[PDB]
Write a protein that binds this ligand. Structure first.
Ligand SMILES: *[C@@H]1O[C@H](CO)[C@@H](O[C@@H]2O[C@H](CO)[C@@H](O[C@@H]3O[C@H](CO[C@H]4O[C@H](CO)[C@@H](O)[C@H](O[C@H]5O[C@H](CO)[C@@H](O)[C@H](O)[C@@H]5O[C@H]5O[C@H](CO)[C@@H](O)[C@H](O)[C@@H]5O)[C@@H]4O)[C@@H](O)[C@H](O[C@H]4O[C@H](CO)[C@@H](O)[C@H](O)[C@@H]4O[C@H]4O[C@H](CO)[C@@H](O)[C@H](O)[C@@H]4O)[C@@H]3O)[C@H](O)[C@H]2NC(C)=O)[C@H](O)[C@H]1NC(C)=O
Ligand SMILES: O=C(OCc1ccc(OC(F)(F)F)cc1)N1C[C@@H]2CN(C(=O)c3ccc4[nH]c(=O)oc4n3)C[C@H]2C1
Ligand SMILES: [Ca+2]
Ligand SMILES: [Ca+2]
Ligand SMILES: [Cl-]
Ligand code: NA
Ligand code: NA
Ligand SMILES: [Zn+2]
Length: 805
């Protein structure tokens, strides 16, 4: 019940919300059906429209009008946004030359520059160039302020996950909003776009910017607007709030626009009907900026123009139906559309088997337009697994397509020409970022970045300390004139040992053999120096990685590579090597095919053994430094050390061998040398964080050798590719991957063909940021460069996406 029989007299768009069953006058009361009787009358005035006209100038104040052109309006803070243009001979903001804002020029009483977030739904990144002619206000913001060519949303590229990621800096798996539609098994409840359940606080985790602000004594405007409050009224409300007394005035504000998303669903991303929505968005920006200029706040306020996701061409005749694949289609529930999520219709059914469902959806039709995954097998870059609201079975759907359960669900629900929600690497899903104001830079282009990073910058822009989040604080310092946050490198927790020769061959009983019993005063001083670290400046270009947890490990030096060997996990955490442009690929000699050699620096008891692999019929083994890339026949022996060995499924060895034999050399040619850091990853609980020893679910049969869930590589070179990787004077260039360690290649439908037809495609799919690898290993890379830490942070957040221009 709401006793709706009070009043909004003098309370229009109040900032503090009152407690039921009292009647409300806040910008959300409509969406709760709880506004006072007179709300429409007093708070949503529309009389006479939104603009001043030549004959409204200096009129008698009539309180019934939407906005005012009277003389006293500037003091009351409620003029139509164009009042000065029409009645005082002033110019529109857009028609002024832009001048650098070197310092905040604010009215007395302002303790900090205010922040206005102008967010636009479905604003595809390419609209900035393609609609440039019809968006003059937005185009002035872009070219005078700081801008990116695009900004990467989170997966799934839906509305609520992306808006709440903007507000919190969290992956949807961590903030809880994992889709536009959700079921929570612990709650036994569903979350929909329509309805009242979405208004319950229990869905929304993390700490959004407005709460972070309130708790630290910064006042916030209310971010959410009811759908029936027109755009023009939202702008006037923000402007009115900005006229309040210093003690009452918020410092952070939000505007939301349903366009162009709303139209893009109907007409598609570039439908001719799309020009008008872009014109109107630009008109609304113009109004805000004209309003700010009237109050002399246009060189004081920081404005962020930001989208949640883009928009793709999608029609009904591009729908795949599960009913064309499954027999038992009635025992399942599907969350449909641009992504697929499958669970059992009833948990009282013990005959339901996810394994057989996946099998029935795997490579069944030659042109198939979705791919099924157990959630833990999704590319790690999506960070989409660690939440009870994310179903075990997931369908990644091809751009331009839909997935539905039965055909009946599509025609008894063509209505639409556009949609979104696909993989966040897809070009048509990219969205926009522009920052404009005293704290942003002047006329600056920055590289593309991810939307998880903004929460930190907004906190910076407001002088707040950010709640723990997924951004990397300092990685967007290059956007800002000042207010920068100065990050330090995490302290190393474990220091390494540097073992020498401590064990005799015969102390080892590992069941390993090698054909290496052959025989010089010159060439023996040489091999000693290599094991002491003479070539280490060649293979360890950026310092050794830091270990940021408590453990026991050894640094091992070799002619061609260096590794940090973990005595706990019985394998290296990392292996580092440089492959120059001129280097040569050789093969493994016939006598050395099954050669594994004891490492006399490491005790038998901290070594793997060959017997375990022989006994394990499923598991085989591979090497981290590839024998193929040894610099000499003699150095090749180092590659067969038991300490370079890691466990690998035969099916995965096909992938690994192609990468090591073909691709590394190809990258060295194209990039003028590469440095490579490879290693194992253990993430059995799929939380995206390094597993402790007691979390490993799988060992090589009859031993304490743990099985990695993934294998990573970080491939670095010089951004100026005229300089070789090992003699680089400037910025670096990186690409990385995290390949799932799987006993089959079911993920690749073309895997019965030659590795050259499918391997590289798979690697591209599982591209990663160095930062993703750091979470998963508890390491910290690039500790010794000549670059600034901020720049290195940007590098660590980079993702190579493999999309075209
Ligand atoms: C992205 O950034 C985020 C944020 O920084 C990272 O997530 C953090 O990771 C931490 C490590 O996993 C985690 O710390 C744990 O906190 C537990 C208490 O957490 C509560 O309080 C916080 C802070 O206010 C709050 O945010 C949490 O809210 C969660 O839960 C509610 C509902 O339950 C949700 O509404 C909300 O969305 C959020 O859920 C998300 O996180 C949880 C995990 O906390 C997931 O399960 C969800 O799927 C979802 O993603 C909480 O209300 C605390 O209990 C933990 O402590 C245990 O572990 C430590 C290890 O040191 C041990 O010493 C303790 O003894 C304790 O173990 C005991 O409990 C065990 C389990 O019951 C039991 O096995 C043992 O026997 C012990 O009894 C732990 O410290 C932190 O909560 C989250 N924060 C957030 C916001 O998600 C994330 O890692 C980043 N991602 C990447 C890739 O880097
Ligand atoms: O006022 C709203 O949001 C303010 C807001 C602004 C910025 C924020 O973040 C930042 F400031 F920190 F940056 C956070 C919040 N709302 C009301 C709208 C109801 N919606 C749909 O119903 C919808 C809209 C488009 C859709 N497309 C689709 O497929 O489903 C959709 N549902 C979308 C909701 C957004
Ligand atoms: Ca949207
Ligand atoms: Ca883990
Ligand atoms: Cl969804
Ligand atoms: Na085997
Ligand atoms: Na296959
Ligand atoms: Zn939409």
């Amino acid at each position: 019940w709401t006793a709706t029989s009070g009043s909004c007299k003098g309370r229009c768009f109040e900032l503090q919300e009152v407690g039921p069953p009292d009647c409300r006058c806040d910008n959300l009361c409509k969406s709760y059906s709880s506004c006072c009787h007179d709300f429409d009358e007093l708070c949503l005035k529309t009389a006479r429209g939104w603009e001043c006209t030549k004959d409204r100038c200096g009129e008698v104040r009539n309180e019934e009008n939407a906005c005012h052109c009277s003389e006293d309006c500037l003091s009351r803070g409620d003029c139509c946004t164009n009042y000065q243009v029409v009645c005082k001979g002033e110019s529109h903001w857009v028609d002024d030359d832009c001048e650098e804002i070197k310092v905040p020029e604010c009215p007395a009483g302002f303790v900090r520059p205010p922040l206005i977030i102008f967010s636009v739904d479905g604003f595809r990144a390419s609209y900035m160039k393609k609609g440039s002619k019809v968006m003059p206000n937005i185009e002035k913001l872009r070219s005078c302020g700081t801008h990116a060519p695009y900004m990467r949303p989170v997966y799934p590229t839906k509305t609520f996950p992306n808006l709440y990621t903007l507000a919190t800096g969290l992956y949807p798996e961590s903030h809880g909003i994992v889709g536009n539609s959700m079921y929570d098994p612990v709650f036994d409840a569903s979350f929909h776009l329509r309805g009242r359940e979405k208004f319950n606080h229990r869905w929304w985790g993390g700490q959004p910017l407005w709460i972070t602000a309130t708790k630290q004594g910064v006042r916030a405007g209310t971010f959410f607007w009811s759908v029936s409050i027109p755009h023009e009224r939202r702008i006037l409300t923000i402007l009115q709030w900005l006229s309040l007394p210093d003690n009452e005035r918020p410092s952070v504000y939000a505007f939301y626009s349903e366009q162009p998303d709303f139209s893009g669903h109907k007409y598609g991303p570039f439908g001719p009907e799309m020009t008008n929505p872009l014109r109107e968005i630009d008109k609304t920006v113009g109004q805000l900026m004209d309003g700010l200029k009237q109050l002399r706040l246009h060189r004081c306020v920081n404005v962020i123009f930001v989208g949640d996701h883009g928009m793709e061409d999608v029609t009904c005749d591009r729908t795949e139906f599960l009913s064309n694949y499954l027999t038992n289609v009635d025992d399942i529930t599907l969350v449909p559309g641009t992504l697929g999520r499958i669970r059992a219709k009833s948990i009282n059914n013990s005959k339901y088997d996810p394994k057989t469902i996946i099998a029935a959806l795997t490579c069944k039709k030659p042109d198939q337009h979705f791919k099924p995954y157990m959630k833990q097998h999704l590319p790690k870059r999506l960070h989409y697994a660690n939440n009870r609201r994310i179903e075990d079975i997931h369908l990644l759907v091809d751009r331009r397509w839909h997935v539905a359960r039965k055909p009946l669900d599509v025609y008894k629900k063509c209505f639409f020409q556009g949609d979104h929600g696909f993989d966040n690497k897809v070009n048509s899903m990219q969205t926009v970022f522009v920052g404009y104001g005293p704290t942003f830079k002047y006329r600056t282009k920055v590289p593309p970045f991810e939307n998880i990073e903004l929460y930190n910058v907004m906190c910076d822009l407001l002088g707040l300390k950010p709640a723990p989040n997924n951004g990397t604080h300092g990685s967007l310092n290059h956007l800002l004139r000042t207010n920068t946050f100065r990050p330090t490198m995490p302290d190393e927790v474990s220091r390494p040992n540097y073992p020498g020769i401590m064990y005799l061959q015969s102390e080892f009983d590992l069941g390993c053999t090698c054909d290496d019993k052959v025989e010089n005063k010159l060439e023996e001083l040489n091999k000693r120096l290599h094991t002491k670290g003479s070539t280490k400046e060649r293979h360890l270009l950026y310092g050794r990685p830091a270990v940021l947890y408590r453990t026991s490990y050894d640094i091992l030096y070799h002619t061609d590579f260096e590794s940090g060997y973990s005595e706990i996990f019985l394998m290296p955490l990392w292996t580092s090597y440089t492959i120059s442009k001129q280097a040569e690929v050789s093969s493994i000699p016939e006598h050395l095919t099954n050669c594994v050699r004891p490492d006399v620096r490491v005790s038998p008891g901290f070594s793997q053994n060959c017997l375990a692999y022989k006994n394990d019929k499923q598991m085989s083994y591979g090497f981290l430094f590839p024998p193929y890339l040894s610099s000499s026949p003699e150095a090749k022996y180092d590659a067969f050390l038991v300490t370079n060995m890691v466990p690998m499924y035969p099916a995965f060895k096909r992938v690994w061998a192609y990468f090591q034999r073909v691709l590394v050399k190809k990258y060295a040619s194209e990039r003028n040398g590469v440095n490579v850091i490879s290693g194992p990853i253990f993430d059995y609980n799929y939380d995206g964080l390094r597993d402790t020893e007691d979390e490993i679910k799988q060992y090589v049969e009859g031993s304490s050798i743990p099985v990695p869930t993934h294998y990573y590589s970080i491939i670095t070179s010089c951004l100026d590719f005229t300089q070789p990787a090992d003699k680089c004077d400037g910025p670096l260039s990186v690409s990385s991957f995290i390949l799932p360690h799987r006993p089959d290649n079911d993920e690749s439908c073309n895997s019965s063909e030659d590795e050259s037809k499918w391997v590289e495609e798979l690697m591209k799919m599982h591209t990663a940021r160095v930062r993703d690898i750091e979470h998963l290993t508890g390491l910290d890379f690039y500790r010794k460069t000549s670059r600034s830490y901020s720049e290195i942070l940007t590098l660590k957040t980079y993702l190579h996406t493999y999309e075209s221009e």
